[PDB]
Ligand binder design. Structure first.
Ligand SMILES: CC(C)c1ccc(CN2CCC(O)CC2)cc1
Length: 166
């Protein structure tokens, strides 16, 4: 069974207006099989709108392409992003971690999604007791995008609610 097509797409902004279906494809085929590759254009002038998308055969290929950023395509650094259910943020809210979850639990789990810069385990302003949620800040938005499309996150035995923050 193939992963849903929506999860295999990269939406690419910042294209050179000279980039074509063919040159976008030749670039991004370096990181996987492309089942689709389109540059968006004006319907009357055919002038590029400056963005397009590609569709890989697997999610691992999307990962490979995203790990190969920055992408310079036809002389211009472009901006690829995956689809989320774009709100481009580097921080997540992690809820449901109760009082026994520590920083290393969150680090050990989330470090495989991306490079962590901040872990903030939330505590009560009056008592100092843990409140049962945390925020994790990464150095880049793709980590967050990968995280929030998962159906499940289990951290320290807890089923966690994870969403984009601010
Ligand atoms: C499916 C197709 C319509 C599509 C839509 C949107 C993008 C990316 N989007 C994000 C940044 C904006 O400034 C414009 C580009 C790429 C492709």
């Amino acid at each position: 069974p193939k992963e849903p097509e929506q999860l295999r797409k990269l939406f690419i902004g910042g294209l050179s207006f000279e980039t074509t279906d063919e040159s976008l494809r030749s670039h991004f085929e370096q990181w996987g099989t492309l089942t689709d590759c389109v540059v968006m254009r004006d319907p009357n002038t055919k002038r590029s709108r400056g963005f397009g998308f590609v569709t890989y055969a697997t999610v691992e290929e999307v990962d490979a392409a995203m790990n190969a950023r920055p992408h310079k395509v036809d002389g211009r650094v472009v901006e690829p992003k995956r689809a989320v259910s774009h709100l481009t943020v580097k921080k997540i809210f992690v809820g449901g971690i109760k009082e026994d979850t520590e920083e290393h639990h969150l680090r050990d789990y989330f470090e495989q999604y991306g490079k962590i810069e901040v872990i903030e385990i939330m505590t009560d302003r009056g008592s100092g007791k843990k409140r049962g949620f945390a925020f994790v800040t990464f150095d880049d938005h793709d980590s967050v995008d990968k995280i929030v499309i998962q159906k499940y996150h289990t951290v320290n035995g807890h089923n966690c609610e994870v969403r984009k923050a601010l």
